[PDB]
Amino acid sequence: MSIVSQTRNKELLDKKIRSEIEAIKKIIAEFDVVKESVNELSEKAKTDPQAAEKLNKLIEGYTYGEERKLYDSALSKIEKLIETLSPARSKSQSTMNQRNRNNRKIV
Amino acid sequence: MSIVSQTRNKELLDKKIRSEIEAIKKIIAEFDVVKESVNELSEKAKTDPQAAEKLNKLIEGYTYGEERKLYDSALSKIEKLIETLSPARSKSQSTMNQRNRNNRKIV
């Protein structure tokens, strides 16, 4: 009766994990964006002196991005989990070849 | 300075990203939960008489994840991403070595 459950579960998990990593990848791409606020006025400042004046006021960028403290090691734990889902050295771990129900197999 | 939106935004993203890894972790465990009693039932149907009785009630709900080939490659790409965000061996990014402590290291 699992057929009535695994009719959407597979798709659900696929789309779920797919979206999770996409959001996280977006998060990690916003950090350098905020840090790029240290030169909001580049060509504009070069053209207009008043814009260059604002440059001395808009020279920020480091506010809430350097939060890689206790949460930094949290990412290290993720790698550990991924490694746990890896072969590490071999793929034949615990599992063993079976397929007894074949009736005279060629291979 | 950027603080109006950065008020509680950090907590929002922190908790959200924390949900991803927890949700994904559960999905991985579900694969073992489903594909658990397979060799202990299907294979044992031929061997044990009681096992064959149970197989007559639940036979569809074992192999539902044998597409592990190009999918794992995507996860490996995730590792590379994490590694790219890590200083790895070059631990000099936004930091420096010290070793400013000896006091006669005769032992």
Residue of A37, A42, A39, A40 whose CA lies nearest to A63? A37
Domains recognised in chain A with CATH numbers: 1-88 (6.10.250.190)
**Which candidate from A24, A63, A98 shows the least CB-CB separation from B39?**
A98
Residues in chain A whose beta carbon is closer than 8 A to a beta carbon of chain B?
Answer: 1-3, 6, 10, 13, 16-17, 20-21, 23-25, 27-28, 34, 37, 60, 63-64, 67, 71, 74-75, 78-79, 81-82, 85, 98, 100-101
Residue of A75, A31, A30 whose CA lies nearest to B81? A75
Tokens 């109006």 locate to: B4
Q: What are the residues facing A90 on neighbouring strands?
A: A88
The method recorded for this entry reads NMR
Give the three-state DSSP class for A88.
Answer: strand
B93 to A20, A87, B9, B89: CA distances (angstroms)? 28, 31, 26, 10
Per DSSP, the residues of B21-68 read HHHHHHHHHHHHHHTSTTTTTTTHHHH-HHHHHHHTT--SSS-----T
Please check whether residue A34 is in contact with residue A61, taking contact to mean a CB–CB distance below 8 angstroms: yes
- A4: phi then psi, degrees, rounded to nearest 5: -85, -10
- A16: phi then psi, degrees, rounded to nearest 5: -60, -65
Rounded CA-CA distance B79/B85 in Å is 10
Rounded CA-CA distance A104/B14 in Å is 57
Chain mean position to CA A58: 30
Chain B residues inside the 8 Å CB shell of A85: 28, 75
Rounded CA-CA distance A19/A27 in Å is 12
Crossing angle, helix A72-84 and helix B9-34, to 10 degrees? 10
**Residue A24: how many CB atoms within 10 A of its CB?**
19
